[PDB]
Structure formats: C-alpha cells, structure tokens
Amino acid sequence: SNAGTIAKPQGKPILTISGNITNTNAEGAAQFDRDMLEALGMETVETTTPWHDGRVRFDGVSLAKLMDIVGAKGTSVTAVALNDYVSTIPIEDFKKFNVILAIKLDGNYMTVREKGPLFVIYPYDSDPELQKQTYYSRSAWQVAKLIVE
Numbered sequence: 001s002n003a004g005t006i007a008k009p010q011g012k013p014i015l016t017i018s019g020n021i022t023n024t025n026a027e028g029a030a031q032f033d034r035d036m037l038e039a040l041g042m043e044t045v046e047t048t049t050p051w052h053d054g055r056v057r058f059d060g061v062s063l064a065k066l067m068d069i070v071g072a073k074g075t076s077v078t079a080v081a082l083n084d085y086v087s088t089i090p091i092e093d094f095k096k097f098n099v100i101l102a103i104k105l106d107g108n109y110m111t112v113r114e115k116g117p118l119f120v121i122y123p124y125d126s127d128p129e130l131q132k133q134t135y136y137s138r139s140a141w142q143v144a145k146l147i148v149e
C-alpha cells in the first residue's frame, strides 16, 4: 500500500527505502531526493577509512533517523548499490554507532566515481570495534536502495 505519510520527492529520487516499513510515498516504498535527505538534518562523521587518504569529513543523514522516518518494523536492512553490491546490516548498528548515509565528502557532493551519491559511513576511528571488516562490509558505497526485513 501507499500510506502517503511522506511527501513525494520534487527532484530525482536517489534513495528508495522499501520492505517491512510503515511510512511511504510510493507503493510499499519511501522515495527520497537529495533535498529531502538534507532536510532531515546533516550530521558529521570525521574519520580515516580503508579507502581514503588521511582523516576525511563526511556529512550526511542519520540512518537511525531514516529508519524512524519510514517506521521500520524489521531488525535487518539490505543495502543495494548502483554497482550491484548487496549488504545486510542489522538496524541496531545505526543506534549503537553514529552511522550516517553520507552525502558530502570534505564539503563536496560525492560523484558515482567518488563512491556516491550515498555511502553508509561508520565512525571507524571512534572505537576499535568499528576498525574491522564486519563494519567495512556494512559500509555500502553508491547506495540506491534500503530493503527492510
């Protein structure tokens, strides 16, 4: 069903959240353009990563907030990337850690060649627990879809 409890996007959708959710703006899905994501509030994560040179600044939307916006009912979300990557992420990670869906890198929007437009980012250098392949594997870049189960 389409609850119609989230506004329809005015620009091109860059993220579709679907599955075991409550709040939608399409059949069984919540479509978001970049303006809608920025409007939810931008959070900052500064960290080194396995893929970047030195400490970089990511700005993006809290994934815990996105799960609350769509009324996620499940405990698992599958990220699907533009490049075909599929990554299952326990939703509890988003709360425990400041995980963000990054939109900007060092103050600039990320192109597809820069792992954008959306990139799941954990604050790796904030806790030795996060400096592990478990969380690097959950850090899906070029995210297009989040399927809640």
Ligand SMILES: OC[C@H]1O[C@H](O)[C@H](O)[C@@H](O)[C@@H]1O
Pocket: 048, 049, 050, 124, 125, 126, 131
């Ligand atoms: O760049 C990701 C991680 O790489 C290494 O494990 C560093 O020791 C750690 O501080 C950092 O968070």
Ligand code: NA
Pocket: 001, 019, 027, 028
């Ligand atoms: Na549905």
Ligand code: NA
Pocket: 088, 134, 137, 138
């Ligand atoms: Na995994």
